């Protein structure tokens, strides 16, 4: 194989998914120069959960999925495997035996608007915490009250999604951070994504 990975389409695409509806891209049949990503000072976080980031160029991967979404800066701590809080509980869970990378960078000049960019949402409510790599799109009205509810709204009933209000004057931690999670599997199956060893 000789053609390079679509990392430009993953890391530089104009608009990312909302974290409740995190987008997945399958990477296959290509060369993956991870030194081009890892040497980049723009990533505020590049944490790997079953490999060293220096060794990624000496490995070949079974299948690779890149998961793309936007979150608040104080919530980037929740994307590590075994963490908990409304993002890890209700919209994006990693399994405790996750093998892969979490890569995150501040987007305040990209995702943040002087009137508030309300285009990005998270899941504020869910009957039960979601399973590893599940995604819940459903906008059924959540019921916090003891009585059942019907129609669009009620007392102690809530719309389950909430938008994040990103402004360029938000304090760091309330600014938007883009996340990419790379979720490969290693050395035990036939492989299709390759570090650039000849």
């Amino acid at each position, epitope marked *: 194989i000789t053609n390079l990975c679509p990392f430009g*389409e993953v890391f*530089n695409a*104009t*608009r990312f998914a909302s974290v409740y509806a995190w987008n997945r891209k399958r990477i296959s049949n290509c060369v993956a120069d991870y030194s081009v990503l890892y040497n980049s000072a723009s990533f505020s976080t590049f944490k790997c959960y079953g490999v060293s980031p220096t060794k990624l160029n000496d490995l070949c991967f079974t299948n690779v999925y890149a998961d793309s979404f936007v979150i608040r800066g104080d919530e980037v701590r929740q994307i590590a495997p075994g963490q908990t809080g409304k993002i890890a509980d209700y919209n994006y869970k990693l399994p405790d035996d996750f093998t892969g990378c979490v890569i995150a960078w501040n*987007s305040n000049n*990209l*995702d943040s*608007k002087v*009137g508030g960019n309300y285009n990005y949402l998270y899941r504020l409510f869910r009957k039960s915490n979601l399973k590893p790599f599940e995604r819940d799109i459903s906008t059924e009205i959540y019921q916090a009250g003891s009585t059942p509810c019907n129609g669009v709204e009620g007392f102690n009933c809530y719309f389950p999604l909430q938008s994040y209000g990103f402004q360029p004057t938000n304090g760091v931690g309330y600014q938007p951070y883009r996340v990419v999670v790379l979720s490969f599997e290693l050395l035990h199956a036939p492989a299709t994504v390759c570090g650039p060893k000849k």
Partner: antibody
Amino acid sequence: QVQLVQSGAEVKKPGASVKVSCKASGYTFTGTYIHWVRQAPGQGLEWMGWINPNSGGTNFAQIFQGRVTLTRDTSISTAYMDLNRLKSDDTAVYYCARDRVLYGRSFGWYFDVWGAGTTVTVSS
Amino acid sequence: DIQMTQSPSSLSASVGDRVTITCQASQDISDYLNWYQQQPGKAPKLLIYDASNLETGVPSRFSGSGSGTDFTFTISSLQPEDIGTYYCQQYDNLPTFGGGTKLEIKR
């Protein structure tokens, strides 16, 4: 090789309707908004609305709201603009244009890839 | 709405002259502006985006600057392929265009 290919010249009576089409190719059709922009003879550009080809959601400029309808057939990567109850000054070149796949802001519209434009003539 | 005005409605300029065209928004638009060129008989082309980010593969002579209500587009030395109408466009609230500035060659 990204491209937007449109229907040929349209000619219409007053009070009728027109169906311009925009066949996309060379990129994933669901990835970005398709805007509809028009240009009257010897005059400036005018944005009509957009369709998000993934969700089918649309937004219009106020002048066209209740006149323009935007739709899409994802099975043939074709976006459509339907304009109803046509008046003489709807005589214009109608373009579809894509909303920049990379390097922009997440809000911003742009118009990075444009179709060839379809002339509509509205007259008695 | 946000109404936009371009100061020269047309501007005659010689080959090798510096061209400056200014676009003013009625509201404060921060840096939410794009610039497009339309050569005679073609669809428009995006040249600058986000008020000053030069697009991929366009000539280095093209510049954009300013923020707030008042913005500029510039050609550092005009070349005879630059002749067309130049339009500014806000993106703060529904993408409105400006009236367009025609360039022409001075003779």
